[PDB]
Design a protein around this ligand. Sequence first.
Ligand SMILES: *[C@@H]1O[C@H](CO)[C@@H](O[C@@H]2O[C@H](CO)[C@@H](O)[C@H](O)[C@H]2NC(C)=O)[C@H](O)[C@H]1NC(C)=O
Ligand SMILES: *[C@@H]1O[C@H](CO)[C@@H](O[C@@H]2O[C@H](CO)[C@@H](O)[C@H](O)[C@H]2NC(C)=O)[C@H](O)[C@H]1NC(C)=O
Ligand SMILES: *[C@@H]1O[C@H](CO)[C@@H](O[C@@H]2O[C@H](CO)[C@@H](O)[C@H](O)[C@H]2NC(C)=O)[C@H](O)[C@H]1NC(C)=O
Ligand SMILES: *[C@@H]1O[C@H](CO)[C@@H](O[C@@H]2O[C@H](CO)[C@@H](O)[C@H](O)[C@H]2NC(C)=O)[C@H](O)[C@H]1NC(C)=O
Ligand SMILES: *[C@@H]1O[C@H](CO)[C@@H](O)[C@H](O)[C@H]1NC(C)=O
Ligand SMILES: *[C@@H]1O[C@H](CO)[C@@H](O)[C@H](O)[C@H]1NC(C)=O
Ligand SMILES: *[C@@H]1O[C@H](CO)[C@@H](O)[C@H](O)[C@H]1NC(C)=O
Ligand SMILES: *[C@@H]1O[C@H](CO)[C@@H](O)[C@H](O)[C@H]1NC(C)=O
Ligand SMILES: *[C@@H]1O[C@H](CO)[C@@H](O)[C@H](O)[C@H]1NC(C)=O
Ligand SMILES: *[C@@H]1O[C@H](CO)[C@@H](O)[C@H](O)[C@H]1NC(C)=O
Ligand SMILES: [Zn+2]
Ligand SMILES: [Zn+2]
Lengths: 637, 637
Amino acid sequence: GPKNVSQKDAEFERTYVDEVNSELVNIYTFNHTVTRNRTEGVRVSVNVLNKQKGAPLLFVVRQKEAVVSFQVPLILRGMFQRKYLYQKVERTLCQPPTKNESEIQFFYVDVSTLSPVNTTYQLRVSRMDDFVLRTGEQFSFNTTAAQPQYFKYEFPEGVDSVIVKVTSNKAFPCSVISIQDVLCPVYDLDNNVAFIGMYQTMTKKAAITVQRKDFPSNSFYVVVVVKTEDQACGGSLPEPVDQGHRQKTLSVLVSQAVTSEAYVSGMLFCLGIFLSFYLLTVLLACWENWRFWNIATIAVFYALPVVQLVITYQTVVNVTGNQDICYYNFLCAHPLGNLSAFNNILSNLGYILLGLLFLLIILQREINHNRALLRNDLCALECGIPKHFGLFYAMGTALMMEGLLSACYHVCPNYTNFQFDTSFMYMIAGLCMLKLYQKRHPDINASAYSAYACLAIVIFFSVLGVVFGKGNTAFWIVFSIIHIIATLLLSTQLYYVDRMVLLVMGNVINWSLAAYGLIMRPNDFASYLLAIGICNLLLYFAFYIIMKLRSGERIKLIPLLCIVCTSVVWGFALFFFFQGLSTWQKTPAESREHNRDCILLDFFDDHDIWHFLSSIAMFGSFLVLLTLDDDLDTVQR
Amino acid sequence: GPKNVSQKDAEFERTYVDEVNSELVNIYTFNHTVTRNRTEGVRVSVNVLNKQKGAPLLFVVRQKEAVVSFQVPLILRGMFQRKYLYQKVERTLCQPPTKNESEIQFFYVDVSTLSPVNTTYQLRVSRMDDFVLRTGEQFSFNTTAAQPQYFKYEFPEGVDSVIVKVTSNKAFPCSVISIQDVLCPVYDLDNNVAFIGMYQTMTKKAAITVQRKDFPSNSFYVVVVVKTEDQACGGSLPEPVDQGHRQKTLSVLVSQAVTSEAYVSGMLFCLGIFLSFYLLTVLLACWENWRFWNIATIAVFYALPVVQLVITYQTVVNVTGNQDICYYNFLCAHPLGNLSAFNNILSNLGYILLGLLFLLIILQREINHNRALLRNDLCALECGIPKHFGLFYAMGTALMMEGLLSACYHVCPNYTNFQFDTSFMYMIAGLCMLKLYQKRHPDINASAYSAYACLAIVIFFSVLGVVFGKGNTAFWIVFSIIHIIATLLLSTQLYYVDRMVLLVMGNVINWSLAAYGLIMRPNDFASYLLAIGICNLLLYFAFYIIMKLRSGERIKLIPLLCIVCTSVVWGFALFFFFQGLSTWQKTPAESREHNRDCILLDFFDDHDIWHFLSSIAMFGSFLVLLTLDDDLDTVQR
Ligand SMILES: *[C@@H]1O[C@H](CO)[C@@H](O[C@@H]2O[C@H](CO)[C@@H](O)[C@H](O)[C@H]2NC(C)=O)[C@H](O)[C@H]1NC(C)=O
Ligand SMILES: *[C@@H]1O[C@H](CO)[C@@H](O[C@@H]2O[C@H](CO)[C@@H](O)[C@H](O)[C@H]2NC(C)=O)[C@H](O)[C@H]1NC(C)=O
Ligand SMILES: *[C@@H]1O[C@H](CO)[C@@H](O[C@@H]2O[C@H](CO)[C@@H](O)[C@H](O)[C@H]2NC(C)=O)[C@H](O)[C@H]1NC(C)=O
Ligand SMILES: *[C@@H]1O[C@H](CO)[C@@H](O[C@@H]2O[C@H](CO)[C@@H](O)[C@H](O)[C@H]2NC(C)=O)[C@H](O)[C@H]1NC(C)=O
Ligand SMILES: *[C@@H]1O[C@H](CO)[C@@H](O)[C@H](O)[C@H]1NC(C)=O
Ligand SMILES: *[C@@H]1O[C@H](CO)[C@@H](O)[C@H](O)[C@H]1NC(C)=O
Ligand SMILES: *[C@@H]1O[C@H](CO)[C@@H](O)[C@H](O)[C@H]1NC(C)=O
Ligand SMILES: *[C@@H]1O[C@H](CO)[C@@H](O)[C@H](O)[C@H]1NC(C)=O
Ligand SMILES: *[C@@H]1O[C@H](CO)[C@@H](O)[C@H](O)[C@H]1NC(C)=O
Ligand SMILES: *[C@@H]1O[C@H](CO)[C@@H](O)[C@H](O)[C@H]1NC(C)=O
Ligand SMILES: [Zn+2]
Ligand SMILES: [Zn+2]
């Protein structure tokens, strides 16, 4: 008729080996003492032995204000109707903050089974002394898919933001690191975990900025969960299948985030240099002298897509809390307002102020030229090299529009959102091809449409590469061969001592870039083709310099200095562009094992320094084009 | 020392009124008999009475192969640290499919509390006889936030796809309708629910297509959950707060989906008419006679964004199962392959074949014109009206590109993804303004750039309206006044009997459209401005006809027929364009209470008929422009 019920008084830190059957139920009564100030965490471990296939043990932990219950061997879901089985289950117990200063709290563990044979479990309830996290101290722990871990941080006084950094040494147990408030329960199951709070799938790295304003209890729970499968982290997979051998050893560090002097140090470093250029130029001019809207039209046909998509799409995460959508550099992302990576946006102040200053140069030069025309001298276009500021204006505005088309990319950098930032750098890379060429020929408008078509073709090839973002080896070699063919065909179009010497030093760099693209197989294709863009640009600059050099004229120092400085800055910028060029892989999990701290002035990482050197180098090359054949203001041949 | 444990034998369909305290535990033992063929569902209801604030009851349902456990009064989360409290909790019990043909199965209900005073619950375990769903039979039920319901469907033989339709009568309890397989457990909690399966937040309507290939058990569970708050369905909100009065009365119907004859009936109806046009024209021509890439360049600058974004973004849902992302017409969406709304994509076969046929017309006419030029007659441009097929080619290709720019919108129609489909209809609406105008003037290229700028300005206003998609009343009235100002300014530019009579019938329709835009305040702005586009287009056509009518010439019938037929088809198309024009609101929940069944041939809804009549009307108007001033091939004044 009735069952045996064995009610017994148990203790902490003492393994209990008992056994139950279909007609026995074991009820253990643990107690402890909780204190207002110091907190502690009970963790229950249960482990059946040589378990039979009949019926699981069923465990119930009853507290004053919550009930937890599971069934051991725990069975978790695969993906395509697969089941994984764990002989060993553990959970920490959520307990609401205490009211009294110290009190005694009980809780009972109920073990029962419906299997008609004995089963020998192994209960053990243990106190946790490393529950609370401390600011700046690394701390390790192990957790399988059946043993979700969680710890508790609470902000000190005067810390209004921290950043949680979790880092494992191996890649293929997956994980989720959620950060929730301290209101029980705690969603730390494979299904509950993504319900609230901000989470991040991790493979080797995870980082989450947390702010005090979110949590009125001045604390939060860091919850670490390990997934049954590694598909969502790039891995591959081959009735229940035993999977109790798969741990993950982690390390959690919670350090304070920059307060306010980083912000001002970022502004007062953008403004303190990009205005240095302004003053330098305006003071140089006095010494020297006293000793239509097509770009914006295309940008407006693209902007409402870019602007609306990115603005709406950031808010989606900002209201969701799923940080696997936008591919920031989470170690260096210092949010202001609703902007997550604020520094990745000031870093585009260069392009803006530099395109603007280039325009303000061209304006003055054009009106000076028309005033000198009103002086009625023979140096209209014969004694000089025919002036056409129409394309200089184009460069000076395209730089401005680049300082906006990527400042919107760096709001949710993403797989789809990519081509915005770097494709617009081909346009400005194309114009330098035009003007230089145009600087030796009367009509280029017939080839201007062809240049627009060539840029569109490059963008289409970039789109194709982005579509096959997992580009096969055949994919890579196909582009390799077609680009070598393009180089070989382009060598002919430029046809002596140095005329053919150019080809000696061109094909080698073509091969070198292709070889690195093949061997690295970088996930990024457009930003890789950009490297070829700059390489061709610099080679063309050098070649035109060489051809100008086989005439008995003399280059004035004022542009020669520009050539050398622009070359050196392009030396820097490609370095900081290759440091981050592999830092973007398929899945946000391993697109996160390439992050890195803020390098310069606590606020800017690599990419934020490339957003600087790129603008300064391109401005330097603009001035090179403006002033390169400047000395030829007398010869009318 | 030890507790009282009262183990008792209970029965189904019999309310149990008992009471427990800190030192009593009640264990009820229910049993039943399960059969291989017929299935049934146990549903437990528990209801504490006049509950005190101390400590909840804790309930545990232990079965052979699963453990469920909750705590009554159940407390669920608000949004900003709010708690809602339910004195009444129910759950159905998942039980795995039985092995034997019939067997006896036990399960125990454990009720216990840690409160040191009596608490009077009310247990009741009831069998469910309407667990299994049947194909084609409506069925109702009630469910609060604490009582998640779920039922079981299993496909018959010969049904490889069904569509679940759930429809409530009131709007502000929210819901989630998940559809999962029949492997226990069943995720029917506010946190588990979105873990697997395909779900849909509902307010008044929900529909989910389900296919047999997904489920190897030839069955699935429909799970209905009611949310604590209505924020994610457009509603607004004002220690635990009692919320036990908020039900939701639903109705679930699971009907078979179209097998294959709908698909062929859709193709053989697109091909059976858009080729009727082909044969009609090619046979008309014999009787009558025997009795550069700018559009594609803009489309390519937009396509890789459109193509890549939409293709990637459909797969996101297709691998997620969260159907609150893409705004289909779920009642009419007949998927093929990975395409959800396949019919919404064939419906753009018109634009393709009709733009193509228009081009093939223009080609023949141009070569006929050049051959006639080789005949060396005086009717070069004087005796006729100056021929320039350059813009006719533009229309004939822009229609093709519209049959692709919206056929990609109708893959995940969305808030961001919108402007693709209808903005490209302004371009073709603009060209008809040009050519007609161009048909009376020698130079329009000076105003061609202005027309491009005007279209860009309209697109920018559309983008601004889309950004403020929740446009305020001040927003609407601002556009109202500025558009009336635009109409008043445009009236002057066209300056008699009828010259000023035109203005009498123009401002009235301007006011009428503005008034309907204000009163309805449609969520869609660009597609609303399109109505003004067609209205202005038709008025301009009529006006040019009137001015041609005050000359003593005679319009040939061949274009006059075209005028009248194009007018009537534009009569139809605007009707089907207004039937779906409010069917797109802010949230996918209520963007779903405007769906409707497939109207024509089991396969096409309203919007799929507008994708037809729009193409045919625009093609008709193209031929009107081509043939309108055709008779003037003799007059050289
Ligand atoms: C609360 O603590 C433990 C439960 O783990 C119970 O066990 C004994 O407690 C006494 C002190 O009160 C000590 O002898 C030991 O800590 C325990 N006994 C042994 C043999 O180790 C204790 O009785 C519990 N108290 C109540 C009121 O339940
Ligand atoms: C987590 O990592 C391992 C998981 O196996 C735990 O056991 C250690 O494993 C390696 C090799 O056996 C060594 O680090 C030690 O010899 C093992 N520890 C022993 C035997 O006690 C390891 O203890 C765990 N580390 C924690 C919890 O900090
Ligand atoms: C299984 O069924 C019920 C539990 O609801 C138990 O109760 C009695 O069953 C007998 C028939 O076996 C009938 O008299 C009634 O259905 C129940 N009694 C009364 C007074 O209504 C039954 O004993 C259970 N059997 C076992 C073996 O547990
Ligand atoms: C679900 O709807 C109501 C929820 O209150 C249930 O009760 C009915 O409510 C209205 C007004 O009282 C009427 O339809 C009936 O008079 C009520 N039913 C009664 C008194 O039995 C209703 O029963 C539920 N319908 C179901 C479960 O089908
Ligand atoms: C437990 O079961 C045994 C026999 O199985 C019986 O003698 C005893 O009375 C039961 N109850 C106990 C030990 O409390
Ligand atoms: C502490 O003691 C009990 C413990 O719950 C309860 O009365 C209350 O929380 C506190 N009361 C006093 C008087 O401190
Ligand atoms: C099962 O467990 C009980 C509890 O100790 C034990 O007495 C018994 O011998 C075991 N084996 C069987 C067959 O009951
Ligand atoms: C239940 O408690 C009562 C007193 O509270 C005691 O007399 C009895 O022995 C206990 N056990 C039962 C009724 O099984
Ligand atoms: C039916 O009876 C029991 C019930 O579990 C078990 O042996 C098995 O499921 C079936 N056995 C036979 C012989 O049918
Ligand atoms: C509490 O419940 C028990 C169980 O019936 C009852 O005997 C008792 O009178 C109730 N009240 C108190 C104060 O114990
Ligand atoms: Zn960038
Ligand atoms: Zn459409």
